[PDB]
Amino acid sequence: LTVKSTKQWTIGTDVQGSERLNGVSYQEDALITYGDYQYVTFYETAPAGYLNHFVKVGRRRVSPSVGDWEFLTLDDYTQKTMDGHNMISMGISGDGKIHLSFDHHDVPINYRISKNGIAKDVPSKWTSDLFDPVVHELVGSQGPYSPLTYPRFEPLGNGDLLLEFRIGQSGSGDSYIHRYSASTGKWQAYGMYIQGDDNNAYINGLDYLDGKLYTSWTVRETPNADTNHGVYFAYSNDDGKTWFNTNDTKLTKPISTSDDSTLIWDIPQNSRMVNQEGQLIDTKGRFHILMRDLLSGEHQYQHYLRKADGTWTKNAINPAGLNGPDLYDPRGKLAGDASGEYLFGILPDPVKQSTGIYVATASKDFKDWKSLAEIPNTSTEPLFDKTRLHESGILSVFVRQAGGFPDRKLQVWDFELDL
Ligand SMILES: *[C@@H]1O[C@H](CO)[C@@H](O[C@@H]2O[C@H](CO)[C@@H](O[C@@H]3O[C@H](CO[C@H]4O[C@H](CO[C@H]5O[C@H](CO)[C@@H](O)[C@H](O)[C@@H]5O)[C@@H](O)[C@H](O[C@H]5O[C@H](CO)[C@@H](O)[C@H](O)[C@@H]5O)[C@@H]4O)[C@@H](O)[C@H](O[C@H]4O[C@H](CO)[C@@H](O)[C@H](O)[C@@H]4O)[C@@H]3O)[C@H](O)[C@H]2NC(C)=O)[C@H](O)[C@H]1NC(C)=O
Ligand SMILES: C[C@@H]1O[C@@H](O)[C@H](O)[C@H](O)[C@H]1O
Ligand SMILES: [Ca+2]
Numbered sequence: 001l002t003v004k005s006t007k008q009w010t011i012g013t014d015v016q017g018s019e020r021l022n023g024v025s026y027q028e029d030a031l032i033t034y035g036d037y038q039y040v041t042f043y044e045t046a047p048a049g050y051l052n053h054f055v056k057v058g059r060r061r062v063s064p065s066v067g068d069w070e071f072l073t074l075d076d077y078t079q080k081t082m083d084g085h086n087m088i089s090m091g092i093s094g095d096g097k098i099h100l101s102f103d104h105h106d107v108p109i110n111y112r113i114s115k116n117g118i119a120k121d122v123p124s125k126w127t128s129d130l131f132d133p134v135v136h137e138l139v140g141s142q143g144p145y146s147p148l149t150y151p152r153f154e155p156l157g158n159g160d161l162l163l164e165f166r167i168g169q170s171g172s173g174d175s176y177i178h179r180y181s182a183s184t185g186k187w188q189a190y191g192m193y194i195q196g197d198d199n200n201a202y203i204n205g206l207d208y209l210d211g212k213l214y215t216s217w218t219v220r221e222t223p224n225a226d227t228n229h230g231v232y233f234a235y236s237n238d239d240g241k242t243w244f245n246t247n248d249t250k251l252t253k254p255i256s257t258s259d260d261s262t263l264i265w266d267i268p269q270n271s272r273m274v275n276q277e278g279q280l281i282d283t284k285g286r287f288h289i290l291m292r293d294l295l296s297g298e299h300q301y302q303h304y305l306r307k308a309d310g311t312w313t314k315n316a317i318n319p320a321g322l323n324g325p326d327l328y329d330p331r332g333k334l335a336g337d338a339s340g341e342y343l344f345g346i347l348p349d350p351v352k353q354s355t356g357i358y359v360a361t362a363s364k365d366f367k368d369w370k371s372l373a374e375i376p377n378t379s380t381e382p383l384f385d386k387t388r389l390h391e392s393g394i395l396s397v398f399v400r401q402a403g404g405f406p407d408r409k410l411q412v413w414d415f416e417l418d419l
């Protein structure tokens, strides 16, 4: 497996401040291909300057040929909170509508949707008038809508879209799911699916494949990040209403964080494992978790694999030259190709200030990690475009640079693989 071409585009100038607002691990998602177009979303500085930002949405044609980016600016909502939690997630439903949810740390929902199905009936002009106003509810559904953190979207097989988030606070919170119907244009409440017990679950993402929805998490006792413990797993066969553990045992609804039947690896507190890293369902149905810990005596990225035959294994990701991350270092992701044979680790290196792309293969039980490429000069939690990789064999990664304002740019890097 080799890289056929590498290309990069500078798409904006990152915002000034001591927190990272663009390129955050739990943006789900930031960079999405739908049909012939790729879409991206990020904050840029508004005319009032420091600590005033607008959401931008970019699109470019990627098929049959790659075209230039064009951007619209949503200049009717000013983001003003210098807090790295307050990121943007985007999702696209099967009616072609683009959904955005943004700017939360324990506050009421901020959500908006396109007026028409602009990712399906593609408009000639890309302007802010394409979007409806910001609202603080999900029409058709019910609250609670506050205090919300961590909006995540997941598209489903019939064109519907899940929106998932935490209600509560660090160290005491629950998680909820809502479902948007592409046929009716309405949301509906699926309710609380994980319930804290004087703690909160931090999921790594949502992964959907062939009618099943998968998630993994750790449990945090207090606002101190050293108090994460455990690696947990569950899946649903009905889009989030009914959940099962790794042994196919039906769970209570909601799942309590005090129920150990979802535990797949005992990791104590003070292991230097961080919440909200990465996960992946590969196209062969194997489930992968990316975390980190110090338990071997060195800081290392860790790969948890759920095999076909229910087994779980844990193996360090330690290719030559990769510096292992501590608790507060940037978080990575796992990507997979359409065939299910290739697993990509998109791993930020906290010493080199770069993002490494590593590959392992199912034929070698994913133990053959090799360097494939590097993105230099990054201070980012890398994010990638799942659909573009599956459909085109192009690994497309959104990054925030290292460096100081206003030199620090936002970029998309495309690695064309000879898959
Ligand atoms: C339902 O699903 C669950 C989840 O998959 C499943 O439970 C697993 O069952 C398998 C097989 O029965 C167990 O696998 C064995 O584990 C042996 C010891 O496990 C210990 O270590 C686990 C890993 O943590 C270690 O390392 C981390 C650092 O990475 C560290 O933090 C830990 O302290 C620890 O050192 C750990 O998760 C596990 O903890 C469970 O058990 C303890 C009590 O023992 C409990 O207190 C915990 O809360 C938790 O329940 C435990 O501490 C291991 O020695 C053994 O290896 C032998 O067999 C393999 C064959 O595969 C050989 O390769 C090897 O050479 C040895 O001969 C084997 O790997 C696994 O531990 C269970 N996992 C959990 C979370 O319980 C249930 O069986 C399923 N039930 C049904 C009905 O299907
Ligand atoms: C460790 C800490 O945990 C949560 O508050 C968020 O994920 C944040 O981004 C991370 O820095
Ligand atoms: Ca996802």
Ligand code: NA
Binding pocket: 171, 172, 198, 199, 221, 222
């Ligand atoms: Na608590």
